[model samples]
Target chain A: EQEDVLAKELEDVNKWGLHVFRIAELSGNRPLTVIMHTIFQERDLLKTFKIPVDTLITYLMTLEDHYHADVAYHNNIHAADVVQSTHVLLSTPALEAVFTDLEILAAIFASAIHDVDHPGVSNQFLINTNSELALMYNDSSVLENHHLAVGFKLLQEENCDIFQNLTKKQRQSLRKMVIDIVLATDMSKHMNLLADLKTMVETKKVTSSGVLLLDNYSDRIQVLQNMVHCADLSNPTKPLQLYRQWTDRIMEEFFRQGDRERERGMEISPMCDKHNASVEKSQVGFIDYIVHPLWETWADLVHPDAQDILDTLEDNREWYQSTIP
Target chain B: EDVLAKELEDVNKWGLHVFRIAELSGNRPLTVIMHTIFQERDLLKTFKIPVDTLITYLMTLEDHYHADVAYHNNIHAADVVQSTHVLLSTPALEAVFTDLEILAAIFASAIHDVDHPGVSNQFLINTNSELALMYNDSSVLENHHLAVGFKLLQEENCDIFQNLTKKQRQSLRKMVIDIVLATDMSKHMNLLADLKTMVETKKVTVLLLDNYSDRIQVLQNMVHCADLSNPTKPLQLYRQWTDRIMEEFFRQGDRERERGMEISPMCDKHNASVEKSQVGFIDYIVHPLWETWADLVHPDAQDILDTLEDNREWYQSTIP
Candidate 1:
């Protein structure tokens, strides 16, 4: 009966404001399991790709374990949230027929492991402190590179290799697409990514069926890159109460890093200074300067579908702005 | 006349370079101001004010802004006047303000920082400067500018308000005083709140209606935006203003150090990062204010806001 309730709740995952937290509750603390399982079933990926159900569950559990639970914001729940958001975006009526089955698989998989094993700190923090991970990645996307490397390493185990049955070329293409999407999640790549997305939207080519048609590798990866990015920044588009909760958790995580920086006699990062940070003002700036611009362009690309999401973002922005002291 | 005519051509364009105008006008920035105000609004014929008397008063007003001051010189005043003109020309604002209000706004900008002492209000209060004591430390410099501005207008040939009725003169005096006083940094939040309120309502009752407080509130915010508009200018012009302002600030810091007083932030040349300081100024002060102003005059002042963002990104990239 509980499993039936979980399956019923997962049906609404394509809708706006789908509560991943509530889904987590209903799924018995296995949000990744519930989300991935529902998506696989909904898209018929399990049957089409002949993915063994037991093998998929074991691989997903291990991937979920990779997220550091102590990290306040960048953890398994955020990964689940991104996956759910990606599913909703791809399920848009106009976008529904555009993506190939393999492309959809790659997008969901990329979102699941985008920030795997994140250290709850920025790449700048790692570089400044000269951490081992930073030195290993040579100061470029230290955490993101680690996430991709570790996530792929896990899939090498025979039982966890979901793509083991695919032809070598198919697996190679999937790996390339996944790597590109995950690496593009880094904030430093934000402008270039948004610029490419904007250009694509401007000169978009569409099929007679009104679906976006991409004939090149660059165009395909660019759309998926922005899709994952939009999901990651979809916090503001969430219900106000849920959005505020995310803000609080992220603030706490940032303040923890601030505490460490102060202890180590380093400069506190912007939005990290606990005593001086105005939560409302910081949210207002973040939504204004970063989130809204990206989402507005995204909404323009997928018209009418993301309109409700944009409405929620505007509503949340006003709420935070009004609460400013 | 030829030099003034050449300079006047540039004054009507958006992003008018005041420094270049000063050079073309043979250091008589007042000529550029006179030509801009009169030509833009055709105010001379409407008000029936004598051109010679107006020019005399404006030239005298320009002289009061000491050429020696790094930041608050006549060039700064000219820049403020030019910015005010650009803002008022915004399509939304064009039909809102009257000729009389425009006259007052132009007048206020011309004398807003006249006789500036090259130090901040806090610096004045710290050192107990004469002007600070004179106004009892309440809007010390602002009150001084108002007093000196009206004092200069008392000269026989320099009386630009001579042709106006008692009622018209009284109204203009109040508007100019209110606008100039609002330029004080201590009143920034209140000014911004009033502008935000106006933008939210979208009615702009300040310009179209007869509500004195609302009218003056809008005008005050306009002048204040003009005064703080250095960062919203074209990049080269903005960089020049930053250099001059920082020089003046460092001079004040030198005085503070000599007197064994606390040096203000961004005033200590030894520790100040010009790029970082500019980025903070844009983030904390300039961006919020201009964003509000742009909303108040949506799509009309959008270019200014765009320029501000571009300038901010340039400064941000300059930081090590």
Candidate 2:
């Protein structure tokens, strides 16, 4: 039955090799099914936080409704992919038993809600068009601000206050952590966020036994910020089919953007020309400049755990380049 | 409505009360703003800003304020707008700036605190407000005010700048952002430091207006001094401002207490020394900056300084 396909793909999560395209297809097109199934795997979170089960379901299902399913790249499926990537990144050896359960919950929640309601346009596109989100947020992290606002607003719904059981202090901390992580996902902060991570790696104060020295909020937040970003940029590091799937979707998204730009006489963004678009070259350049540089530094911080991710990224880059020139 | 007309008639004067204007009309700050722009400068016809379009824009802006906030609402914005108009007209600085600069100054002051959430930047950052997150915790509210203000202007029939040339809008945009961002308290000392340096090295008035770097030094301080103009106000007006600001600070302190955090200075309602805090504020913060500002304008700011001293002395003498 079709239900077996979804059940089998969810085993992919436990099996550490989720096929999100298959999950989205088999689960009546709601990749939020992945979010629900994954969170339920954390019984520790469910019981420890006294979270209401039905409330969590209602929250995730409603949160999924806001995504622009018509958008090719950023949709419920993209969010689902990022969440699984985040869950995997958190489980790596170096981060083990380091963050509090509260922080862990915040990481998962932040990733799930990070890109809700994305309109499949760039921040520059919104600013140029004088879009309402640009007006509401003043063109400063335009998308990220709306994402956080709508994400938190959803929790206020009755029976959807999954954060309800937390103590005042705990709830406050969770919101802070969640906001910091989600805001760091904005691409404008990419260089600065990476620089801060590199600074941590260079001047890092670690224990002799090699636990990372994150004694305060800043250092701990730096680690989590970079973790969410890594997951966001993890598409190239995925298996080739998923990487290729993301490429196809993202190319179509930018093609729409370019098409709009041509119509309005706005300058087309680079690699956005659908007619002569070179996907393999675009993927190769993205990996070389952005993805590889970030994951390389990240692998240094996590030591050997992320080495395989680096290798996969390298292999994916070569495969793309081979298909190019 | 007759009371409103009488109160608004003297809107061009230095001591005009926005609190009264706020009471008389649903228009509130919009009435004060339009009156001043018309009476002082005739900006509507000069800029070709359609009168109806201006009203549409300002009404949208006025309702954006949190009237429930004890201070930093549209009434406070109108007060700052009036003070800015008054400061620009001070005799020593007469004929020194452009109409464009004047219009931008009035407009900037009017929307400088739009949609203010009645809390400090530190409080927003400490509590991890979504705004602080949006602005990365630097001048968070000031940035939001300017953004919201400019956006309102972009709405249908609200394009107050529609007649402005492409060059004029770009020039106006740069200065508005600069003026509003300078109002951030974190930059207060730096702003003062810049003003003091200008006094020691810069000229008196009209000649320096040739360079924007020279002129904005004065205007940045103009809006800021108006923002700091409360203590220099007459005792009744000064007293009301004191009560409202304390209530807002106390509200912040009330949350800090409820949420288990250290109370910010001058915010603790139970332990507050309102009069002493006022004296300390005047002595430590306002007087030094305004004194240097007075030094540049000389006799023009002298009367203002005298009132500042009187207010400080009155508060200093009232301690238990």
Candidate 3:
């Protein structure tokens, strides 16, 4: 039953990759053909991309160890999901020629680290009330920045060097892309980034032939920005079984935050209401208000596979529609 | 009195421009101007940019405003001053670009909250709030400010931006929008983070290139710090600003409360202890953030930091 749940939920490419790697470790040498089929299904070329699979597996395990208890939603499971979604999203025909190996690595790496142990609440709330994270981060994007630093810092551990085998130039490119993608996850930065991305797309800045020539930092960062955003909203794209699991987890996360808010005598966010457990309503709200619009725009760029995922999302949303009453 | 008031009010180019614009309203323009600007001799001696032209353009822009609000009212004399102080002291800014930035910063601050009501943004948004609904819960006040500010610049005489190239104008819009939005307290953390990151990653050689984006980002953070700096000021000064903001917040809350509406947070005095709570808010919340900011700016912000500490101690001593 758990395995079935994992299969349905772990459709995010990175998540699926980790699941395969973990399963291979448990069962001893699962065939390459199986792993490749699990990731791309049709694209054998995607399997040939210089993916440091072992490195990613090591990183995922580290995340599992660090975030197991407190960050209920964004544990190893969420990281795997985001990574999976990133892979599938990147595989969208529109992005095939645009993304380099470094871009792919950065996208995967960022998904793994985006919410290492996210404590719910905006940065303002944390800093305004003087939470420990606020003090340690000097009241900045204390958690987000901390997550980025910790993610990179973990790379220093020899076994965790997911990029250890990369050439120095490749490593540098990966570093830049990773930092940009992760930092862009700040909710505060969302509107401006999306606006910029919208403008770039609207202007039809791509070459007439359809390939994105990301020759500089801004262009590269812009693509990574959209890529990570889709990864963050990966929950909606999940199959029904997996989608239900994430809904449960995020609700639990929201409830914990609500509990903290009540303990502190601060008002709780609307979705954090535990007694009612209006998972359907909140998921619908997040999808309608935040998730759907973001993914819809991204799908316009990525298309096909993302469209299927969006179809799953609409279907899942409909499942909750009946539950609302 | 002007000199003492300059120290007392902390007036700057922003205040000067606002004073010029406020001149158009049936109010006492000269009195407002006197209240805001230094003496001609003092202005000339201390001023860096073409103050006269900037003032003229501001006065031209002032002709369009049909109304006013609390924070953006004549009281912006102080906001502009504080904003100017912030822009002047931006970390690693070039001396060459200071005039343009100081001009834009002052102009932005002056026009930032023009024709404003005393209500907070949340009040506008949560009540199926007229302004909130009007702007779709985006930065209603901030967007209004940008629109009005640009509208004022449309005047032939007031076109301070007329000399700006298309690129420069675009950058100016981006910068002005950023700074104006920063005045909205909700944007505080992200704005500060972006600024800090820019500072950290800034190439040493290009430090002062003060383009539209860089200047505006710094200015936005600066004005926000200035607006929030009330709690970190000398107790007497801090007390006065807090009283005003609280009064403004309460009036909005009272209106909602009268309507049998859900009371806005921080607006209900019963929930907030006011003075004592503000002190903690400053020390634990506001101070730590600003201190990190001061450290980032280092030498440029040393004096502001000193003032902030003095203000914090002043609050601590007087809060009881």
Highest-scoring model, DockQ:
2
Give per-residue lDDT, candidate 2, residue A149. Answer: 76
The digit string of per-residue lDDT tens for model 3 on A1-325 reads: 6456445533533432244334433323321223333553333323444436665556546654554445657665565556566766676666657776567667766777777666656676675564656534433356776676667666666576755667767765676677678778887777787777777666544566665556777877787878878777777766676677677778877788788877888777677868766777788888887777777777665544367767877887888888988
Q: Which 10 residues in a row give candidate 3 chain B its minimum summed lDDT?
A: B13-22
**Candidate 3 lDDT (Cα, 0 to 1):** 0.60
In CAPRI terms, model 3 is classed as incorrect
Model 2 residue runs over 4 Å out of place are A14-17, A39-43, B1-46, B55-74, B85-103, B114-157, B165-224, B234-236, B243-273, B283-306
lDDT of 3 at B68: 39
Q: What's the ranking of the predictions by lDDT, best on top?
A: 2, 1, 3
Write down the worst ten-residue block by lDDT for model 1 chain B. Answer: B128-137
DockQ of each: 0.01, 0.34, 0.02
Q: How big is the positional error of residue B197 in model 1, measured in Å on the Cα after superposition?
A: 54
Candidate 1 C-alpha lDDT tens digits along B21-68: 788777777656755667678887777778888888888888888888
Q: How much does each candidate deviate from the true structure in C-alpha RMSD? A: 22.4, 5.0, 21.6
- TM-score of the first chain of model 1: 0.96
Strongest candidate by TM-score: 2
List TM-scores for all candidates, in order. Answer: 0.50, 0.81, 0.48
Q: Candidate 3 has what TM-score?
A: 0.48
**Model 1, residue A197: what's the lDDT?**
80
